[PDB]
């Protein structure tokens, strides 16, 4: 004499992404002409 | 190759010390000063790298 029904469906989702980058650049140009001395009084010599 | 005068009269004074220990010490600046070694034989040119 009667009939009865149910249902439940239920569904859940998750994405997480992460993205890290880093560069870095280091250039140098070193051009030297040379060396300059100056001379200490303890060295002893005559040009001081 | 003629050694300058100012080189020798640093080596003289430095073997003119009184004790041993001073003539080391004078002879270490002296070379402190002036080198260890000396290039006698020289390649001339441009090398790139």
Do not use: C
């Not at chain 2, 080596?11 to 004078?26: I, N, Y």
């Not at chain 2, 002879?27 to 020289?42: A, C, D, I, P």
């Amino acid at each position: 004499f009667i009939t009865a029904n149910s249902e439940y469906s239920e569904s859940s989702s998750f994405k997480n992404t992460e993205t890290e980058k880093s560069m870095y650049t280091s250039s140098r140009y070193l051009f030297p002409q040379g060396r300059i001395d100056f001379t200490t009084p303890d060295s002893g010599f005559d040009d001081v | 190759i003629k050694l300058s005068p100012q080189f020798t009269s640093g080596v003289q004074a430095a073997l003119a010390k009184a004790t041993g220990t001073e003539k080391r010490e004078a002879l270490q600046n002296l070379f402190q000063e002036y080198g260890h070694v000396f290039r006698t034989k020289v390649h001339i040119g441009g090398v790139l790298s």
